[PDB]
Amino acid sequence: MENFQKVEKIGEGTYGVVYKARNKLTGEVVALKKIVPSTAIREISLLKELNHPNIVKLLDVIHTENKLYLVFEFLHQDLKKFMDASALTGIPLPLIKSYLFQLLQGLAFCHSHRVLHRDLKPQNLLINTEGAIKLADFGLARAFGVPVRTYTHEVVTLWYRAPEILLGCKYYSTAVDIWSLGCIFAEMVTRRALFPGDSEIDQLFRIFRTLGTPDEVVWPGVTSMPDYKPSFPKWARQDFSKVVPPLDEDGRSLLSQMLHYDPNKRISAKAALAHPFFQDVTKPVPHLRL
Numbered sequence: 001m002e003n004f005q006k007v008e009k010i011g012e013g014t015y016g017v018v019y020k021a022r023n024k025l026t027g028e029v030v031a032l033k034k035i036v037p038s039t040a041i042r043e044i045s046l047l048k049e050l051n052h053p054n055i056v057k058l059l060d061v062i063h064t065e066n067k068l069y070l071v072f073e074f075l076h077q078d079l080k081k082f083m084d085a086s087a088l089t090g091i092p093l094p095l096i097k098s099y100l101f102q103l104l105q106g107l108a109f110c111h112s113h114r115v116l117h118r119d120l121k122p123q124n125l126l127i128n129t130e131g132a133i134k135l136a137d138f139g140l141a142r143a144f145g146v147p148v149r150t151y152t153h154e155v156v157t158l159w160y161r162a163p164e165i166l167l168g169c170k171y172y173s174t175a176v177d178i179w180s181l182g183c184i185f186a187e188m189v190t191r192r193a194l195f196p197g198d199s200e201i202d203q204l205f206r207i208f209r210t211l212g213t214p215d216e217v218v219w220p221g222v223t224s225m226p227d228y229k230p231s232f233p234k235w236a237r238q239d240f241s242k243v244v245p246p247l248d249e250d251g252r253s254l255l256s257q258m259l260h261y262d263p264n265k266r267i268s269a270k271a272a273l274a275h276p277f278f279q280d281v282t283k284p285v286p287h288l289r290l
């Protein structure tokens with residue numbers, strides 16, 4: 001840590017305080033995350049080779065005195081801040097599309113190397129002035145476990161959690177990131193979170209109230225998951241035209257496939273890249289205030 005000069009405390013991520021810092025020798029500006037058992041060091045260290053334009057680069061892993069600091073590429077704004085700034089107007093559809101498309105490429109790449117994010121949320125999607133969007137914290141939950149409470153004991157968000165995770169599946173897959181991204185896609189479009197649960201049961205029931213209570217007809221095997229209860233209220237599914245009204249039928253069709261209950265049929269990132277919604281995808285530049 002003597003190689004850096006902390007400029008400002010960017011905020012509090014899942015694992016600790018995130019800082020804006022400057023490398024004392026090179027003068028590079030980086031984001032430094034304060035977070036070790038050997039396993040987690042080997043795993044994180046493997047994440048230093050997982051480079052992609054739509055993945056926030058892990059620059060270095062600093063372990064000093066039982067303290068672990070992750071050094072990432074610095075981006076200029078996170079997506080939550082950008083949506084908050086875009087609230088009265090909403091993010092233009094062509095930019096929403098470019099962003100979805102890029103994030104689907106970042107997920108396709110990590111998922112081809114069998115790496116999952118598991119905790120995708122607007123705060124860990126980072127954007128720059130050239131129109132790029134990148135995922136931060138890729139592969140960290142498997143590396144260290146995503147806590148219930150953060151370092152400040154900030155509530156860990158459940159809003160983007162896939163239903164197989166909430167239902168107790170222990171071996172869930174790369175489909176959980178597609179579910180999260182579909183929720184983030186919905187939120188960009190409507191300017192409201194899709195499923196803002198404030199507890200695990202509320203998260204699930206908000207899901208069930210909009211997509212219908214899952215059963216063996218739409219999700220084979222769901223009735224045998226660990227936390228599934230036959231006493232769940234049985235709600236009817238809602239139309240997607242009511243869920244993300246703004247969106248055209250191609251977008252609603254892709255979102256519906258990203259929010260399939262059954263993880264095995266949920267659309268994969270690579271297959272989502274070929275959906276017709278992306279036929280006229282472009283790369284607009286956001287309007288940023290840094």
Ligand SMILES: Nc1nc(N)c(N=O)c(OCC2CCCCC2)n1
Binds near residue numbers: 014031
């Ligand atoms: N600028 C910047 N660059 C990063 N690479 C980065 N995370 O990886 C990051 O994170 C900013 C977030 C952290 C979570 C709380 C909300 C603010 N910022």
